[PDB]
Design a protein around this nucleic acid. Structure first.
Lengths: 172, 222, 51, 185, 58, 159
RNA sequence: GCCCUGAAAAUGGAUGGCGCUCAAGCGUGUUACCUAUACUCUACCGUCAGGGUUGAUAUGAUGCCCUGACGAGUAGGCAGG
RNA sequence: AAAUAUGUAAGAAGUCCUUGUUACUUAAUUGAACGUGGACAUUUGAAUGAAGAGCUUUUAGUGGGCCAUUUUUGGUAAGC
RNA sequence: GGAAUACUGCCAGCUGGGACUGAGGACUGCGACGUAAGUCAAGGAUGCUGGCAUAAUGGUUAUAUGCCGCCCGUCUUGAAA
């Protein structure tokens, strides 16, 4: 929906005269801004507990800046999408840079083939695969060969004007 | 009388000390805001340093600006806008936050885009789009003597006095907000930023509560 | 007869808010703040990084 | 556009100037608009407001009605002013001297007042004596005592004098007036 | 030649154009329908205090 | 044809109760009704005498007439585009005191109770009923209460 | 999920047409860009409303002036010409 | 037993203390209606708004409607 | 262990370029700079140049171009039909 930013949200409910400071729950959520972040947390607590937006309070909002935003990490993520004729689960693995990048490239890819909008997709868990050769889907393991190399055939150059004079080639 | 040497000098003498009162009161104010954030930012630091979390008090006032036009409005929402002094498209007033007031907002969301404003936004709105009320007769604020002639018997002998109550929610705040004509704003300069304006801000639209994001939208209008 | 808004046209910004004169003299929009040595407690950081 | 909480371009609904094309009457407005605008008294405003009325809203005041205002406690020497015509009443014998100011004094009023020691006064003469209306009493004639108001808004079980030309038997006492003939109203 | 039977549309919109009047109660409301035995009291009760208030003040 | 009777469309409206049938208790009679008292209407199907029309149910009026075994009430019926003062005379079993009003009664003396204290000490009246104000700044504790991570549950049919 | 079979009508005839297929098609974000009699500021016309203006030589106080908000519309009403 | 909608109240025609009248009622100047003397005033006692509030007379035209979201009836369905 | 950077927000921070308008028609209001006289960007424009000086600007008219625009009155839920 935008340049995605992960968030953590902490909720303490409303302390009654009997049970103050009940649980101080927490959840990791994937959103674009703090305004939507404070709304997904309630949308996800109501599906698991007996508290709602009225009977609740946001304690703290924080952002987890990546410790290694430069290393090419490996990710395996589970998705639960409310499809046209029900819901289903998958295990899709992708590696762009990091979590916020992986979530972004997930949604376009997830909506590309399954036509599942942002409001019909559940993010189960995002974790980094520590040891190599622990991935099952072949299209990701395919790019882990030692000293991989391949060319880029059929290069197309970006014309500036509307006319060219030399019949440009497609070399690279 | 001659009216050439005595009254005019005294009139300037009375005027010159009034500015000193405004300046001295502003010096009191300017110390107050800096202590405000310096004590809530530091308290936020000390909560984490003590192993805890700090929840600040919710914002005590919101700026509500109409998004929808005038046609095709249901009767119950329409009466809400009239009581909110929100008549035209792109018109805004400062609304006190209260459970009594909050229920109207959640009933008028499809036609307003409100949120928590910041002192910078209020600073320009009062200065630029400042309109008084004297037997109706909406007139620009401009001078600092018109306000004391209309609010002096409720205190507030300066425009800086008025802008402090419109943000800090003073005791006599309702009529202080009611003294100001509804803020008539233009269309956003940089655009609304969304394809369709009538989706909720969570759903990628414009209407509904947007907390602190209203500051960016208002600055384009003002 | 005409509405001369504040901010621009400094003169109309001086008939209002006499504090605006000394505000520019001492900046107050670029004032330097004081730094501290209160690093957040170690019991908070792992909650931030926890899965 | 602009949503309307009221009706736009509404008229005040009050008369800002008399409809009568009287050259002398406009002169009365001329004097009083100067006072009403400048004198900070409500006596000038109410006299000016009551002077733009029509004849129906300007009922004739019986000369005896003034007499009631004079044995009103504490108003023995108070001068009386009234906008409109003051008639005479053939049912009063005692009349205090006093001083009466009005627009048109009828022949009976012109005689009974002067013979008791009083003087008929025009609205201009009181202005040079009481610009703001010092020790001045205003009174209005009966308005709901007119013949036409007794017919207004009649309905069943209201008894408001239905409009009929000839009165007596065979005229509006049949079915709809007595229980024996059909129903009662 | 069928016609429209009945419809309540625009009736509330028509009615609200004049504000819907409050029934505007007064001080000392009308005594119609009051118990006649108490009403016989109410006439005599005020009649007695009529002279009582008049005789007391002199 | 069409039926528009006096008590038409009253089948779940004048039912006595479930497990509360029988003769009405004696507390409804032993209450004192005075002229000028706010009441409520709840029609009792036990005795049809002095029973209001189906339109009046839960309506609130003011007592103006008190006869031997009935009470007169006034109902501001909304018919057409105006309010009409409808006078109703009802028996004592189809009526009960509206305790919405009585709460105001001790509120009058409650404000008057500390009215004497307000003038005794000084100013500080603040007797206007404030609405639900927003919460002020509060701090939470983590000692002994650690945040618990939560994730959406994977789908499973369990049927 | 797309596409394909399922899928057959009558003056030649359509996503508006040309056309377009790592498309100008499909789903998803990012911005930048064009505007209505919509909003903003200004002048003017009119209406309404609220106000100031007898001081005389020298012309109108059923006049002069100031401020603010509004202006759609059949049946229909009233007013100024 | 919901949601939407809906009735009433948020007070100066109000409360408290002493007291009178009444042909009603009461065993009982004991009750019920209203006043007589004194106290409570501008946070006088929920929020927001109020191109002012209320009131009267007169009459043109109008009494073939249709469409859309939402709920629903008849008919399989309909631009019914 | 140490910063910088990225993101957001603020300045009564400094400026460069472009476009429309300049309404009102003595003085009389709040201001700023100077102890001082006075000045100003403060209740809405002035200063200096030039060319023509009369069909040159401009109005009307005819045609051309870009775009838009279906014969009125009438009943009628509904018409250009």
């Amino acid at each position: 929906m935008a340049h995605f930013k992960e968030y953590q949200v902490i909720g303490r409910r409303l302390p009654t005269e009997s049970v103050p400071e009940p649980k101080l729950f927490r959840m990791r959520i994937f959103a674009s801004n703090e305004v939507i972040a404070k709304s997904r947390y309630w949308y996800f607590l109501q599906k698991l507990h007996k508290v709602k937006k009225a009977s609740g309070e946001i304690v703290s909002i924080n952002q987890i800046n990546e410790a290694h935003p430069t290393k090419v990490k490996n990710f395996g993520v589970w998705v639960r999408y409310d499809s046209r004729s029900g819901t289903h689960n998958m295990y899709k693995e992708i590696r762009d840079v990091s979590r916020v990048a992986a979530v972004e490239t997930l949604y376009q890819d997830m909506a590309a083939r399954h036509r599942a909008r942002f409001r019909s997709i559940h993010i189960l868990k995002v974790a980094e695969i520590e040891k190599t050769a622990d991935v099952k889907r072949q299209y990701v393991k395919q790019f882990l060969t030692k000293d991989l190399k391949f060319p880029l055939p059929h290069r197309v150059q970006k014309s500036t004007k509307t006319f060219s004079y030399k019949r440009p080639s497609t070399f690279y | 009388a001659e009216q050439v040497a005595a009254e005019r000098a005294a009139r300037k003498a009375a005027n010159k000390e009034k500015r000193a009162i405004i300046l001295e009161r502003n010096a009191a104010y300017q110390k107050e805001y800096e202590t405000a954030e310096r004590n809530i930012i530091q308290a936020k630091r000390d909560a984490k340093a003590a192993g805890s979390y700090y929840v600040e008090a919710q914002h005590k006032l919101v700026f509500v600006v109409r998004i929808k036009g005038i046609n095709k409005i249901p009767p119950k929402p329409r009466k809400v806008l009239q009581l909110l002094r929100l008549t035209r498209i792109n018109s805004g007033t400062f609304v006190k936050v209260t459970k009594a007031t909050l229920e109207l907002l959640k009933l008028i969301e499809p036609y307003v885009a409100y949120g928590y404003p910041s002192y910078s936004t209020i600073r320009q709105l009062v200065y630029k789009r400042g309109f008084g009320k004297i037997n109706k007769q909406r007139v620009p604020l401009s001078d600092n003597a018109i306000i004391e002639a209309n609010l002096g018997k409720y205190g507030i002998l300066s425009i800086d006095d008025l802008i402090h109550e419109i943000i800090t929610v003073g005791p006599h705040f309702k009529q202080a907000n009611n003294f100001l004509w509804p803020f008539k704003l233009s269309n956003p300069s940089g655009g609304w930023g969304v394809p369709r304006k009538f989706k909720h801000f969570i759903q990628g639209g414009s209407f509904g509560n947007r907390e602190e994001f209203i500051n960016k939208l208002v600055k384009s209008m003002n | 007869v005409l509405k001369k808004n504040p901010l621009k046209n400094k003169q109309v910004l001086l008939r209002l808010n006499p504090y605006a004169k000394v505000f520019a003299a001492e900046k107050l929009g670029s004032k330097k703040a004081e730094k501290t040595g209160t690093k957040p407690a170690a019991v908070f950081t792992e909650t931030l990084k926890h899965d | 556009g602009i949503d309307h909480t009221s009706k736009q371009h509404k008229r005040s609904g009050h008369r800002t100037a008399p409809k009568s094309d009287n050259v002398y009457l406009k002169l009365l407005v001329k004097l009083y608009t100067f006072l009403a605008r400048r004198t900070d008294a409500p006596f000038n405003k109410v006299v000016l407001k009551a002077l733009f009325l029509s004849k129906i809203n300007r009922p004739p005041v019986s000369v005896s009605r003034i007499a009631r205002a004079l044995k009103q406690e504490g108003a023995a020497n108070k001068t009386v002013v009234v906008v409109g015509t003051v008639t005479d009443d053939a049912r009063i014998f005692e009349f205090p001297k006093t001083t009466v100011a009005a627009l048109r004094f009828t022949a009976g009023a012109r005689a009974k007042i002067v013979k008791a020691g009083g003087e008929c006064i025009t609205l201009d003469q009181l202005a040079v004596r009481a610009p703001k209306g010092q020790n001045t009493l205003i009174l209005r004639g009966p308005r709901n005592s007119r013949e036409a108001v007794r017919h207004f808004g009649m309905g069943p079980h209201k008894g408001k004098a239905p409009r009929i030309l000839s009165t007596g038997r065979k005229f509006e006492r049949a079915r709809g007036r007595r229980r024996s003939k059909g129903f009662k109203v | 030649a069928k016609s429209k039977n009945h419809t309540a549309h625009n009736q509330t919109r028509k009615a609200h154009r004049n504000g819907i009047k409050k029934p505007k109660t007064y001080k000392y409301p009308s005594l119609k329908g009051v118990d006649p035995k108490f009403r016989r009291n109410h006439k005599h009760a005020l009649h007695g205090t009529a002279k009582a208030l008049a005789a007391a003040k002199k | 044809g069409k039926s528009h009777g006096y008590r038409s469309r009253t089948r779940y409206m004048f039912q006595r109760d479930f497990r509360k049938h029988g003769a009405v208790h004696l507390s409804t009679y032993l209450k004192v009704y005075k002229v000028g008292d706010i009441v409520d209407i709840k029609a009792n199907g036990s005795i049809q005498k002095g029973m209001p029309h189906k339109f009046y149910q839960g309506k609130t009026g003011v007592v103006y007439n008190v006869t031997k075994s009935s009470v007169g009430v006034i109902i501001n019926k909304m018919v057409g585009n105006r309010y009409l003062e409808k006078r109703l005379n009802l028996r004592v079993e189809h009526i009960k005191h509206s305790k919405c009003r009585q709460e105001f009664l001790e509120r009058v003396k409650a404000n008057a109770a500390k009215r004497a204290e307000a003038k005794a000490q000084g100013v500080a009246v603040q007797l206007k009923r404030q609405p639900a104000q927003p919460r002020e700044s509060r701090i939470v504790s983590t000692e002994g209460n650690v945040p618990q991570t939560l994730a959406p549950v994977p789908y499973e049919t369990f049927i």
